[PDB]
Scaffold this active site. Structure first.
Site, PDB file in Angstrom:
ATOM      1  N   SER A  45      -2.084  -2.625   5.834  1.00 38.72           N
ATOM      2  CA  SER A  45      -3.363  -2.030   6.271  1.00 38.72           C
ATOM      3  C   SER A  45      -3.900  -2.676   7.551  1.00 38.72           C
ATOM      4  O   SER A  45      -4.894  -2.192   8.077  1.00 38.72           O
ATOM      5  CB  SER A  45      -4.395  -2.169   5.154  1.00 38.72           C
ATOM      6  N   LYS A  48      -4.723  -0.348  10.500  1.00 45.08           N
ATOM      7  CA  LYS A  48      -5.897   0.510  10.523  1.00 45.08           C
ATOM      8  C   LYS A  48      -6.844   0.130  11.665  1.00 45.08           C
ATOM      9  O   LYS A  48      -7.560   0.955  12.199  1.00 45.08           O
ATOM     10  CB  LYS A  48      -6.591   0.474   9.188  1.00 45.08           C
ATOM     11  N   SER A 105     -10.411  -0.526   3.401  1.00 44.61           N
ATOM     12  CA  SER A 105      -8.973  -0.268   3.364  1.00 44.61           C
ATOM     13  C   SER A 105      -8.629   1.082   2.709  1.00 44.61           C
ATOM     14  O   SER A 105      -7.625   1.232   2.014  1.00 44.61           O
ATOM     15  CB  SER A 105      -8.214  -1.444   2.722  1.00 44.61           C
ATOM     16  N   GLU A 141       0.219   6.562   4.662  1.00 39.87           N
ATOM     17  CA  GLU A 141      -0.137   5.855   3.433  1.00 39.87           C
ATOM     18  C   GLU A 141       0.335   6.708   2.252  1.00 39.87           C
ATOM     19  O   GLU A 141       0.110   7.916   2.265  1.00 39.87           O
ATOM     20  CB  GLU A 141      -1.622   5.617   3.329  1.00 39.87           C
ATOM     21  N   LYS A 209      -9.027  -7.817   9.613  1.00 34.20           N
ATOM     22  CA  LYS A 209      -8.504  -6.787   8.689  1.00 34.20           C
ATOM     23  C   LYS A 209      -7.327  -7.423   8.021  1.00 34.20           C
ATOM     24  O   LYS A 209      -6.441  -8.022   8.683  1.00 34.20           O
ATOM     25  CB  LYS A 209      -8.091  -5.532   9.467  1.00 34.20           C
ATOM     26  N   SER A 210      -7.275  -7.290   6.698  1.00 28.88           N
ATOM     27  CA  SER A 210      -6.147  -7.805   5.933  1.00 28.88           C
ATOM     28  C   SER A 210      -5.230  -6.661   5.495  1.00 28.88           C
ATOM     29  O   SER A 210      -5.594  -5.479   5.581  1.00 28.88           O
ATOM     30  CB  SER A 210      -6.623  -8.638   4.730  1.00 28.88           C
ATOM     31  N   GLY A 211      -4.065  -6.999   4.918  1.00 30.98           N
ATOM     32  CA  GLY A 211      -3.225  -5.970   4.267  1.00 30.98           C
ATOM     33  C   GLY A 211      -2.353  -6.629   3.226  1.00 30.98           C
ATOM     34  O   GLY A 211      -2.177  -7.868   3.204  1.00 30.98           O
ATOM     35  N   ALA A 212      -1.937  -5.790   2.303  1.00 33.68           N
ATOM     36  CA  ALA A 212      -1.026  -6.112   1.232  1.00 33.68           C
ATOM     37  C   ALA A 212      -0.054  -4.973   1.043  1.00 33.68           C
ATOM     38  O   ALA A 212      -0.439  -3.829   1.110  1.00 33.68           O
ATOM     39  CB  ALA A 212      -1.805  -6.418  -0.043  1.00 33.68           C
TER      40      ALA A 212
END
Ligand SMILES: N#C/C(=C/Nc1ccc(Nc2ccccc2)cc1)c1nn[nH]n1
Ligand SMILES: N#C/C(=C/Nc1ccc(Nc2ccccc2)cc1)c1nn[nH]n1
Length: 263
Positions: A45, A48, A105, A141, A209-212
Site C-alpha cells: 500500500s 498509494k 489504506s 488491489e 504510508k505503510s504497507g503489508a
C-alpha cells in the site's frame, strides 16, 4: 549513522528476512544511510502515495478535479475497504478517495483512483516521466500484494522510492497546493502514523504510508523531523519473514530508536 545499520542487520537476523533501508536528507537528497538501496521489494500500500501524486498531477494540469464524484457498486468492492464500503449510495469525491487510500489504506479507493489515471501502466509511465525508471505498478488491489519471491511486479527499490517521495513532496513536480495536500494526507495516516508519532520525541512531525502484503512483506515510507517540520525521508521494506508482529515490531523499534538517537 552506522549504529542504525547495525540494527538493520539485527533485524535481518531476527526476522530471517531481507530489509531495505534509506535515510535521505529532505533538502538535498543526499543519501545519509542505506542498506540494499537498489534491491527490489514489493511496494504494497505504500504505492498509494505515488498514485495520489499522479492524481494531483492531473488536478494541477486541469485533467481532474478533487471534488469530482465517483460512483461504484457492490461488485467493485475488494478486501479491506473501510471507507468505500460505506458510500455505495453516496459515492465519493476524488479528494475523499485519496484520503481513504492514504489514511485508511482503503483498497477499493485505490482501485477507483487507478482507473481515473489510466491504471497501473499509466502510474508506471508517470513515475518513469519524473525520473524513476525502476518503480513499477503492474496489478490492482489486492493482487499487487502477492509478493512472489523474485517477482519484479509491483516493486520499488528503497533508493528510488526515497528519491521519488522527495520529488513529490518538495520538488516542482506538483504545485505547492498539491504537494501540501499530499503530505497532509500522509500526516493523517491512521494505520502506522499514530504508533510512530507516539514513539517519536514530543513535538516531532511525521507523515507516512505503510504497507503489508503476503509472505511477511512490510514497508513504510515517511517524511519526519523535529519541531513540527520534516527534514528527512526514511524508507524501510522487508520481505520473506515468518516472524509475527511482536518480533517485527521490536525490530522497527530498534531501528527507529537508533535513527532518532543518532539524528
Ligand atoms: N551482516 C551484514 C551485512 C551488512 N551489510 C552492510 C552494508 C553496508 C554497510 N555500510 C557501512 C557504512 C559505514 C560504516 C559502517 C557500515 C554496513 C553493512 C549484509 N548482509 N548481507 N548484505 N549485507
Ligand atoms: N519500544 C520501543 C522504541 C521504539 N521507538 C521508535 C523510535 C523511532 C521510530 N520512528 C520511525 C520512523 C520511521 C521509520 C521507522 C521508525 C520508531 C520507533 C524505543 N526504544 N528506545 N527508544 N525508542
Amino acid at each position: 549513522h552506522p549504529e542504525t545499520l547495525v540494527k538493520v542487520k539485527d533485524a535481518e537476523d531476527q526476522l530471517g528476512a531481507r530489509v531495505g533501508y534509506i535515510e535521505l536528507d529532505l533538502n538535498s537528497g543526499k543519501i545519509l544511510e542505506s542498506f540494499r538501496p537498489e534491491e527490489r521489494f514489493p511496494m504494497m500500500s505504500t504505492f498509494k502515495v505515488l498514485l495520489c501524486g499522479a492524481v494531483l498531477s492531473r488536478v494541477d494540469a486541469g485533467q481532474e478535479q478533487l471534488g469530482r464524484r465517483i460512483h461504484y457498486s457492490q461488485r467493485d468492492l475488494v478486501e479491506y475497504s473501510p471507507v468505500t464500503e460505506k458510500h455505495l449510495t453516496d459515492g465519493m469525491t476524488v479528494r475523499e478517495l485519496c484520503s481513504a487510500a492514504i489514511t485508511m489504506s482503503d483498497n477499493t479507493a485505490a482501485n477507483l483512483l487507478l482507473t481515473t489515471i489510466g491504471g497501473p501502466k499509466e502510474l508506471t509511465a508517470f513515475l518513469h516521466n519524473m525520473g524513476d525508471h525502476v518503480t513499477r505498478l503492474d496489478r490492482w488491489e489486492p493482487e499487487l500484494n502477492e509478493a512472489i519471491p523474485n517477482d519484479e511486479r509491483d516493486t520499488t527499490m528503497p533508493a528510488a522510492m526515497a528519491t521519488t517521495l522527495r520529488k513529490l513532496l518538495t520538488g516542482e513536480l506538483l504545485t505547492l497546493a498539491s504537494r501540501q495536500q499530499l503530505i497532509d494526507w500522509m500526516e493523517a495516516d491512521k494505520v502506522a502514523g499514530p504508533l510512530l508519532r507516539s514513539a517519536l520525541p514530543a513535538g516531532w512531525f511525521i507523515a507516512d504510508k505503510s504497507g503489508a502484503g503476503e509472505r511477511g512483506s512490510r514497508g513504510i515510507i515517511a517524511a519526519l523531523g523535529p519541531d513540527g517540520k520534516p527534514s528527512r525521508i526514511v524508507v524501510i521494506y522487508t520481505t520473506g519473514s515468518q516472524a509475527t508482529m511482536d518480533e517485527r515490531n521490536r525490530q522497527i523499534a530498534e531501528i527507529g530508536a537508533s535513527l532518532i538517537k543518532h539524528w
